Design a protein around this ligand. Structure first.
Ligand SMILES: O=C(O)c1ccccn1
Ligand SMILES: O=C(O)c1ccccn1
Ligand SMILES: O=C(O)c1ccccn1
Lengths: 499, 508, 508, 499
């Protein structure tokens, strides 16, 4: 396993290359850390709640200029940012691996997501389409226009520490908004590097300095951002608890929220499923990112006629998964984020067996003496007699519960029964089963796929889910509309009014 | 003036209800009462639903939804078409009930029923659209699309002032979107809702549609609160005063539900030096005094350039003095009564406070013929010239009070428009091309509706209706407002038989 | 079988025309004749328009357009709503005329009239949409939008086989788009057009709309040609055989006009090894034999996997032998007559040539009860097994002939589908998820309509209807097909008071 | 004036820098030329009609691969092309000035149009939106999809020798089409440079070589392209004669055309017009590019109450226009393209005075001895008593006809009376007049603007016009739909059919 001194030097190098002034951000209030060894990297300055208020003030002042800057000019800034991200892709990806623990190929993919949404937002900057339409009034004209909203508060999580902010910031900036970003306390360095690169693009563009600001600190900092009367939109990604904080209190001040609170995602495996395809897809979606994606596969609903062979094949695969240092290309499963994540995983597996389940593979901590402060775990495969309490309540860990069904409508009911609703997949060769799964009475999730897993999503699609996932959408399609305000304009050019 | 008697109003209400298919014996009772602002009197008592009845109604609506959501949308549109035909057939009867319960003049009552018919026609068109998207995917041998699906039971909370059109907007759209509806009408206007529901129930019977597609729950606040709190109601659409917002918005958010909120406006019009004054005075009177100042879109603030402020006030003063106030069934009437005594009280307190904050009462504000209908509150709309936009101006009163403010620079007029906490509609009267465009620009008026040379009530079925800030953010009726009634799904379909292998490893 | 007599048909036609408001005395004459495929006989003579009359009709339609184009689209929609109500009222009468002139069975005639009603409902929705766009501009202090405007007079050329629905698609959409219409119906089906126009003229009178919004011109080819050549007709919508294409397309292009061309299809269905054979045989019979093979969307080629080809042919042979052929007014009839003797002649020549090109006639092809109605051509649909897709298979005959081809690899079936010069509709019958998606993929079926587990007539109001290659490229009815009836404008609005100075020089 | 030897060396340098192999393209069949001096630069190889057939075959073979290449991957090629255009912007702009004669600032702007449509097309590559919509059939699903069309024939003109092709090629390539480009015989070098840069992007992307090909030659080459049965779309830009060739014969083989055949564009000047704004706007739109834009202002319809002062101000401005070498930054008006252009201009002015008009300014050839083979002319200002034959028939030269009106509806009628219909503008301070001009009974053109001239257009808008302009649209909004084919798909998953 990579040494902590080596990791710290890599982090400082990447930060410096991305334009971070290490002397200016170091301090004693917070500590950067790495799940690779569990070690603290170095101390950081923190922001206070008054700092948040000052940051919102600076973002709002920037917004007053940015909102009348033509959207194609705002797109030119985002185009330049994408060029800088391309130039520093490896440096940023190193920070993503160091702080989030994800393997390098996934860290590079996450940085590429940033570049791709930049390119998409540059296209959007000439669109942001409203409508023109007839009016019933003679000698009048009617249209619908879209306008910049204001300061956007972005709350992101540890597991996608750069892509979620990029989704929000690339779209928000092209929409004429400004951004105040509160990253996860677990992943501040990625955010500092992102912000420094964007500040460089802002300088090159001659744009206002307050277009984007990062606030580093604990829960009190994020609370102050959520409560700000000058933040009309809060975009929050995290686990379910973040909804009951953020949603209601922003609603209480008549603000808007985009909430994406994770999922408890299932795939249905029908009798005609290609089992090699299904096993590969399930392994990648259940074990990838050590089960720490919003879209992670956590429930496999398998037809009773193939359930035994599917569990046998998955058991063999799970026993073969390469666990290790996420900087090694041979690794598929890196570490969990911290000790509490490991403890919660162990507690879920213990509860599952007490609720009648059978642990088929995985669950054991790997090479603890190689890094006693880090938690490398083999993903767990648990066969369950029913969708019990532990199955319905998501644990943010690599645990794949296997359930059986006979009738497709019951598989759909099992998919839909849980409180979350992010993504779902069906593996089938049957044309009708595929369509039934995607029909109005099929899977109820925001993402519903055929013959690809629960992480099957891309930039051009709206990303998000239903029920306790929170209802928000980000990235593609017309998700941008949540960052602007609609106006309906009637124009009288006839000189008369009804008497 | 001569005001209809309560007994004459009751007889007309009962005739209208019977013609619309309501069983008077079944809906009458002793728990609540129907009433009329025309005299302030109770008409007759009504049976009420309990909170338990609300839960039963929601569960029955959900059962109906389980069938309706797989009924093809064009077939769902056929039901709405049939309902529109019944509304057309009973337009006069329903308009009678709107005048009786809301107090609005006959022509406005007819226009509100026509709004229902028009949104039915619009929703029938939508029933073949409800467009999602197909789009490229980056993955070879895959397809990508976005689809829209029926959401579930929609709870509709409506207000006294548009007792049929708001529900119609929500129900016509929700039904073609595959949703079902539980409607809590205003405690002040139950009869209009009973008549609407009876006509829709006839359409449902004619169509062979599920019986639980729409239900009216008649009750007080505990009935409405139970509807808002139901875990089986994924969307609550609420129209009412600002206080409905902090109620409904956070509560529904707390259970991961969706809301559409339209909580009224404090709407302003800017009058520039080049304004056509005949056009402007007519538009301002209609928008300030119409519906006795009880529209969400009512004109409450007039922001007039200092060069023409004196002549505009003179003309408005004369016009307000000529307003015909009386029984809303008489064709001569332009201004009917306020809804109840509490509305009159709040109006008088606002006018008194405006004069204490430095304002000058230019016209109106007095109760008319109080002895002719002692329980009813007919008032002349008030015109108040204000030296600044003080607290009483920024706090909207649901009453016909028009505050006149002066400005010099257009950016000051825009700031005056935007400074209030509401944000429903705004208008600018100008002959100047650049001023009109500046008012509508991103740094212009901040409202959900922003118009040129038409007042703050200038809106129509085809546009999205709603506003910003404390108005609540929701949109109803036109454009793609229907998307709030459905859930988006993003679908990736793999037909390649292959998946990307993580780290190149094949686990098979 | 028992076939209605010409005199009984004429009496029913005259009753239907009178009920729809046609003045029989005014339209009768000696220039042309109405006829019926049920017996092949002339019904009665009609007055005809001259080419000069066409120019007069176009100029009158243009005068109407000058008023209609500034009539608000929702008001234009109200006219179309009224027309839909009259169509609903006279559905049976109009369907009688469709059966009499086109020869299609009662249920199909009723369905075609219902298509008219449905597109009216759709167009009423469109009348509040006709959406353009608003979008950012790169220029500070400017605004940018895209608007859609009424185009002008639309010339509609329709065919005998859908004598009312095609005009309805064009007219309902054109009218709400602010256009006016001059309609040249098939020389074979004038009475349906006279009845439609009389009902629309009543709607126009009820609405107080301009009288020249729609006119029917009754004539031969010189009347149609004058319409196509008119410099006052910016859009010609033409439905007919392939030969209508090289006529209309280039001529209208030569005067910088626009065309919508839908020139029929040579439509195929692929039957894969996993196809549900009961579903497939029923769908194939309905799509091949329905309307006596005289739909633009008729199934003419069946591309069947070699593993199931023998059993599919056996089942189709038995089904074709059981088809009930007879008078289309009898409820027992599924297959009515071909339109005329020339259609029968071309069918016999194609079947004879197919057997000479190596094919095997499996069922049908014979004229039924020739002595019962000697001037009418009732035929049993032909089923022909072909060893290859030879010339006669690639050249479509407007007759019920189903050619059966075999394949092994799906890419071969797709090539067989795509190899013909027409490109209207295609279908695949399969239980396999990947085959269904492959058929619809960019390298799949090349047609304008491509379906899974539904035949080649699987289309509906909400979709754009039309095809590719020699089908002609046009789209009608649903989605945003309406844009072909309007002109796009891109509007930049400067409110900044400034312009970019070329080379920085201020010439003022 | 720049010397021919200097110009030739600049052209060869720019070509080489853009990757052109000078030995491979030089020949004896055609000659490159420059309007700066009228001189021939050097000889070029030409293609034969069989070469066109071979090029179409190669483009079609490329199309069979490109049409299943995911559109976002096709967008990555266009993104790379835009980067190469940015890198070689000055080199390409030099070739545009040398061949088209336009001043360097306009040549740079035209190359920037290419870069901007590349960025827009990269956004489109994740959109290309069809629809999903309800079906009336129980247990069915309905959608509308868009598919690559095939080989696109592009015919461009001398006056925008790179931007028009870029509009067509960036959109076509993202739409999965391939391109065969026949540039103007007058401007082959720009096309060779564009094609070489795109071939470099294709090589970097690993894309098929036949995605884009240039065919250099005379009318027989373009005719063979237009007639090809494997070219389903022809996009043609040029003067009106190109419509009656291209439109009807492509229609005769059931192909599709996009036609943009220029304009006879007018601006209305109302009594409340800002006259400083109007004079500047009119001078730029009438005299820019020496009157050789499709969007050039050719008709000024001025209210009678201000007509005298507007003509006086325009006369003064026209007398002050800087005519000269388009490589000199002081130049506003460069040369006309060739002697025939000058002759046609002179003939139009002579006809205008015979039809009752008064030449107020301009029309004289400038410094002929400085370059006897080049035609530098001062733009002509002609006051006309009515919209006579010469006013209604466009001459591709800087001639601005001044007409008077009193009632706005008559100004609109004068605007609309001509056979072309590309662009129109109104200069007014009056809110109602502005809206009346843009209303359904207002200006009939494809582009209709307020307080900006007839060249007021940009990437995000659909570009094109009505009537004899030809009806086509290019560039923005959903112009891309003309490059693809619509499919309507009904999917039955219920297992049943109506009996
Ligand atoms: O305030 C208004 O103008 C309004 C409110 C609801 C429904 C219709 N109109
Ligand atoms: O061929 C068809 O199926 C068709 C043609 C025109 C109108 C309706 N249907
Ligand atoms: O005439 C114009 O302004 C034009 C023409 C083609 C491309 C860009 N601009």
């Amino acid at each position: 396993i990579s040494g902590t001194d080596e990791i710290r030097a890599r982090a400082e190098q990447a930060l410096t290359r991305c334009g971070v002034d290490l002397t200016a951000v170091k301090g004693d209030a917070l500590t950067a850390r790495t799940p690779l060894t569990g070690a603290d990297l170095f101390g950081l300055r923190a922001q206070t709640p008054e700092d948040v208020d000052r940051a919102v003030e600076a973002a709002h002042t920037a917004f007053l200029t940015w909102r009348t800057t033509p959207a194609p000019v705002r797109g030119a800034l985002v185009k330049r940012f994408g060029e800088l991200l391309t130039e520093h892709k490896q440096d940023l990806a190193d920070l993503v691996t160091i702080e989030a623990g994800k393997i390098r190929s996934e860290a590079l993919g996450e940085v590429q997501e940033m570049i791709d949404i930049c390119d998409f937002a540059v296209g959007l900057s000439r669109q942001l389409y409203g409508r023109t339409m007839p009016t019933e009034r003679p000698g009048h004209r009617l249209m619908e226009t879209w306008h910049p909203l204001g300061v956007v508060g972005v709350i992101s999580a540890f597991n996608f520490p750069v892509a979620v902010w990029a989704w929000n910031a690339a779209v928000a900036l092209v929409c004429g908004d400004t951004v105040v970003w509160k990253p996860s306390e677990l992943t501040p360095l990625t955010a500092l590097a992102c912000a420094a690169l964007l500040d460089l693009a802002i300088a090159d563009a001659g744009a206002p300095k307050g277009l984007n600001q990062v606030v580093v600190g604990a829960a009190d900092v994020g609370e102050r951002l959520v409560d700000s009367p000058r933040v009309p939109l809060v975009s929050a990604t995290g686990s379910t608890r973040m909804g009951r904080a953020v949603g209601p209190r922003v609603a209480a001040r008549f603000g808007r929220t985009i909430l994406e609170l994770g999922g408890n995602n299932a795939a249905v495996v029908t009798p005609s499923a290609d089992l090699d395809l299904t096993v590969n897809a399930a392994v990648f979606a259940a074990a990838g990112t050590a089960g720490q994606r919003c879209t992670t596969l956590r429930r496999l609903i398998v037809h009773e006629d193939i359930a035994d062979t599917v569990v046998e094949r998955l058991t063999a695969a799970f026993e073969r998964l390469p666990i290790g240092d996420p900087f090694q290309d041979t690794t598929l499963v890196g570490p969990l984020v911290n000790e509490a994540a490991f403890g919660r995983m162990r507690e879920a597996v213990e509860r599952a067996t007490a609720e009648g389940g059978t642990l088929c593979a995985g669950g054991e901590r790997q090479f603890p003496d190689a890094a006693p402060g880090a938690y490398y775990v083999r993903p767990a495969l648990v066969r369950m007699p029913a969708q019990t309490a532990v199955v319905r309540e998501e644990t943010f860990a690599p645990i794949l519960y296997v359930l059986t069904y006979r009738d497709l409508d019951e598989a759909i009911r099992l998919n839909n029964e849980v409180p979350q609703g992010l993504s779902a997949g069906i593996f089938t060769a049957d044309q009708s089963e595929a369509e039934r799964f995607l029909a109005p009475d099929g899977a109820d999730c925001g993402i519903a796929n055929v013959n690809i897993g629960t992480s099957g999503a891309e930039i051009g699609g709206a990303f998000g889910g239903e029920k306790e996932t929170g209802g928000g959408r980000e990235s593609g399609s017309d998700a941008w509309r949540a960052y602007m305000r609609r106006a309906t304009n009637t124009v009288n050019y006839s000189g008369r009014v009804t008497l």
